[PDB]
Each structure stands twice: as C-alpha cells, then as structure tokens.
C-alpha cells in the first residue's frame, strides 16, 4: 500500500507553533509526498511564489534520508478553479505546451511525478466537453512521460489525479475506464461530504451511511463513494482513499440537539492557527477536547464528533483512522492520502500522543515499507 501525504505551502505562514516547514517532515513516514500547489502561466506549469523553489529543494532533499520516497507536484485545487484548465485543454497546441513545461519543470526540480488536481472537469463552470478533453490530456500526458522515459532512459514520471467524491460531479467530469488506464493513481476526495451550508450537522469523512442520510446523502460516505468508482471501471489497486486531518465546525441553533442531523445556523469561528471558518485542524480539535468539549462516537458511521455549548465538530481521530485502515483491505491497494499533513499533530504539543498521531496510525496499519 502507499501512504501519501500532502504538504500545504501556506502552512509555514501560520503562528510559529502552528507553522510547518517542508524539512520538518519525517522522511520515513510516507511513501509519497505531494506539494501544496503549483501555478499556471501561458499554459505552462510554474510556481505560485518565488519562495516555493526553496520548498522544492527542501522537500526533495528528504529523498537523501529515504531513497524510496517519491515526491509529486500538485497543480489545481479548489481556489484555482476550473477556468485555467478548460482553456489549456481547449487546443492540442496549448496541451503540448503544458505537457512539455511539466516535464522540463518536474525534471529540473527533482520531482518524481505530477498530481493533477483540476477541481471538477465538468462542473463549477467547466463545459461537458471538458469531461472528454480532460481524458485526452491524460492519455496525451501519459504518452510523453512514457517517451521521455524511453529516450532519456530514467524511471518514468508518475501521473496521478484527484477524483470527485460526489456522484453527480463524478458523472459529469470523469471517464473512469479510460482514466484508470492512463493514470498511476487516483486520489479520491472522501472528505467534506458534509458542511455547514447543508443546514444540519454532518460528518466530514464518514465510513458508512447515517440512519439520517436520505436521497443523494445516502452516498455521502467512504464506502459508497469508493464502490461507485470501483463499479464503474476503476482498478482497486489504483484507488487511493482520502484521509482528512481536520474537521468541520457548525453552530447548533439549539444546544439541546447535539446529534447527527441536528439543525444548524452557520459555520464555526476561525481556529487560532488555521484561520478560516468552518474548519479546525486535528491538533486544534485536541485543544477543544482538552477544554471540556463533550466527545462522542458515531457508531453507525464509525467516526468521532464533539461539542461545546453551541459548537459542533465532526472530525477523525486515531480510532476512526484505524477502523478505516482495516476497511481499506477491499484490495484497496495503493492505499491512503493524508489531507493535509501539516494539520496533523506533527509536534505532539496539542495531542500528547507523539508526532503525527493520525499518520503514524495509517503508517503502522498499512505496514509502510522502506529499507531505512
Ligand atoms: N488538491 C486539493 C486537495 O488538497 C484536496 O484533497 C482536494 C479535495 O478537497 O481539493 C484540492 O484542491
């Protein structure tokens, strides 16, 4: 199995004790490390900020301590949006320019591969044709990586891609049979399945359906999502399950109702270090628990959730990860991806359970392999 881990670029911009630098990561903890996000300019891959080139050098410099470790560069993301991709895949000319720049760029900075993260190739403003086009880009990109590897004579560069965790998004933007043929891996976004927008309390990455999940919500769970992918042509070995190191905060309209499906008003207040609304890193949830937040286990969905006053949090802990890692033996080889690493108690300061409690669990249960 593979233990992939995301390293956010804006993580080192958090308050000192909440700041995570690329060289602070354990080289033997993951099998694949993915870099926050790269940018695009003139249908050419490029960095987001000059500071980045220094993160690349430090990120790949870990391959000295762990020779089997592989690093990938991710382009895309939610903020990025579909617009730039739609325009880059529009013509074979633009396509060939991106692909070559991705090769030059990746080979120059010592990356072993590229992670495409086109947030939804068929929705959010992307036309239906992009479902077909996205497929073309992959087949084309896979082929050049292949030629480059033959002529230059070096291990081929990996090509992965994220995949929707929402049925209706998968149907309009992903050609799974063809895609599962050209990609090396598919990181499935099995998280954010419920958010304060829904209007009720829900869970971030539930393993199973909730006795309250009705209609399309019945599929809003790891088990159902993975099965849809598998049933539509995706190879189990190539599927990589999403493991979030954070939770989502809601605000109960009645502190009397603190269970799943409880009526909500809005997202929760920003956390001390991760400054957003609606979220809380794993280590930030530990403080919440430590300050008297009533912790309860969701048996039907196999995940935890806690609450304080009118503050509700749906997250994941070591127990939910272990339970999820055992389920992962659905020949769901390949394995899991931690999203994001910097949101795990990397220092042991907040959750007094040593470094990377969540990732350490996945690593042990997936028996991560490394002659080091
Ligand atoms: N590439 C990022 C990932 O960090 C995240 O796993 C995915 C689904 O949320 O969103 C993307 O934009």
Curated annotation (Swiss-Prot):
Activity vs pH: Optimum pH is 4.5-5.0.
UniProt xrefs under Gene3D superfamilies? 3.10.50.10, Glycosidases
SMART domains on file: Glyco_18 (SM00636)
* Disulfide-bonded cysteines: 5-30, 286-351
Write out the GO cellular component annotations. Answer: cytoplasm; cytoplasmic vesicle; extracellular region; nuclear envelope; rough endoplasmic reticulum lumen
- Transmembrane stretches, start-end: none
Residues binding chitin are 49-50, 76-79, 120, 189-192, 339
Q: Does the keyword Acetylation apply?
A: no
Main location group: secreted
What keywords are assigned to this protein?
Carbohydrate metabolism, Chitin-binding, Cytoplasm, Disulfide bond, Endoplasmic reticulum, Glycosidase, Hydrolase, Inflammatory response, Lectin, Nucleus, Polysaccharide degradation, Secreted, Signal
Per its UniProt entry, which superkingdom is the organism in? Eukaryota
Q: Where is the GH18 domain?
A: 1-369
**Induction remarks:** Up-regulated in response to IL3 and IL4, during the inflammatory response and upon parasitic infection.
Q: What compartments host this protein?
A: Secreted; Rough endoplasmic reticulum lumen; Nucleus envelope; Cytoplasm
Pfam families, alphabetized: Glyco_hydro_18 (PF00704)
Q: Which reaction does it catalyse?
A: Hydrolysis of terminal non-reducing N-acetyl-D-hexosamine residues in N-acetyl-beta-D-hexosaminides
Q: Which GO terms describe its biological process?
A: inflammatory response; polysaccharide catabolic process; response to nematode; response to selenium ion
| Tissues where this protein is expressed | Expressed in peritoneal cavity macrophages and in peritoneal and bone marrow-derived neutrophils. Abundantly expressed in bone marrow, with moderate levels detected in gastric antrum, spleen and in alveolar macrophages in lung. Not detected in brain, heart, liver, kidney, stomach, intestine, skeletal muscle, ovary, testis, thymus and lymph nodes (at protein level). Detected at low levels in bone marrow, spleen, thymus and lung. Barely detectable in intestine, kidney and coecum.
GO MF annotations, alphabetized = beta-N-acetylhexosaminidase activity; carbohydrate binding; chitin binding
Q: Which InterPro entries does the annotation name?
A: Chitinase_II/V-like_cat, Chitinase_insertion_sf, Glyco_hydro18_cat, Glycoside_hydrolase_SF, Glycosyl_Hydrlase_18
Similarity comment text for this entry:
Belongs to the glycosyl hydrolase 18 family. Chitinase class II subfamily.
Function description: Lectin that binds saccharides with a free amino group, such as glucosamine or galactosamine. Binding to oligomeric saccharides is much stronger than binding to mono- or disaccharides. Also binds chitin and heparin. Has weak hexosaminidase activity but no chitinase activity. Has chemotactic activity for T-lymphocytes, bone marrow cells and eosinophils. May play a role in inflammation and allergy.
| PANTHER family for the chain | CHITINASE, CHITINASE-LIKE PROTEIN 3-RELATED
Query: What is the name of the protein in this document?
Result: Chitinase-like protein 3
Q: Which organism is it from?
A: Mus musculus (Mouse)
What would be the name of the gene that encodes this protein?
Answer: Chil3
């Amino acid at each position: 199995y593979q233990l992939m881990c995301y390293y956010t670029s804006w993580a080192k911009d958090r308050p000192i004790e909440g700041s995570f630098k690329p060289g602070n990561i354990d080289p033997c903890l993951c099998t694949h490390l993915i870099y926050a996000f790269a940018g695009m300019q003139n249908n050419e891959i490029t960095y987001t900020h000059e500071q980045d080139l220094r993160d690349y050098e430090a990120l790949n410099g870990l391959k000295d301590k762990n020779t089997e470790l592989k690093t990938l560069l991710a382009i895309g993301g939610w903020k990025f949006g579909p617009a730039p991709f739609s325009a880059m895949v529009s013509t074979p000319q633009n396509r060939q320019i991106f692909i070559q720049s991705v090769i030059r760029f990746l080979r120059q900075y010592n990356f072993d591969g590229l992670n495409l993260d086109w947030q939804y190739p068929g929705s959010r403003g992307s036309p239906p044709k992009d479902k077909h086009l996205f497929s073309v880009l992959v087949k084309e990109m896979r082929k050049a990586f292949e030629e480059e590897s033959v002529e230059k004579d070096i291990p081929r560069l990996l090509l992965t891609s994220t995949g929707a965790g929402i049925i209706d998004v998968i149907k309009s933007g992903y050609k799974i049979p063809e895609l599962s043929q050209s990609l090396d891996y598919i990181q499935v976004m099995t998280y954010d399945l419920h958010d304060p927008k829904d209007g009720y309390t829900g869970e971030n990455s539930p393993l199973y359906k909730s006795p309250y999940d009705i209609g399309k919500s019945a599929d809003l769970n790891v088990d159902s999502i993975i099965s849809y992918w598998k049933d539509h042509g995706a190879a189990s070995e190539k599927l990589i399950v999403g493991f979030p190191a954070y939770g989502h905060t809601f605000i109960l309209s009645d502190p009397s109702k603190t269970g799943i499906g409880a009526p909500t008003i809005s997202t929760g207040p920003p956390g001390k270090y991760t400054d957003e609304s609606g979220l809380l890193a794993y280590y930030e949830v530990c403080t919440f628990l430590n300050e008297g937040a009533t912790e309860v286990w969701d048996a039907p969905q196999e995940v935890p959730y806690a609450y304080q006053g009118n503050e509700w949090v749906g997250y994941d802990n070591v127990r939910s990860f272990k339970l999820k890692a055992q389920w992962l033996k659905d020949n769901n080889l390949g394995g899991a991806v931690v999203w994001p690493l910097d949101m795990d108690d990397f220092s042991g300061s907040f959750c007094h359970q040593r470094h990377f409690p969540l990732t350490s669990t996945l690593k042990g249960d997936l028996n991560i392999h490394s002659a080091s």
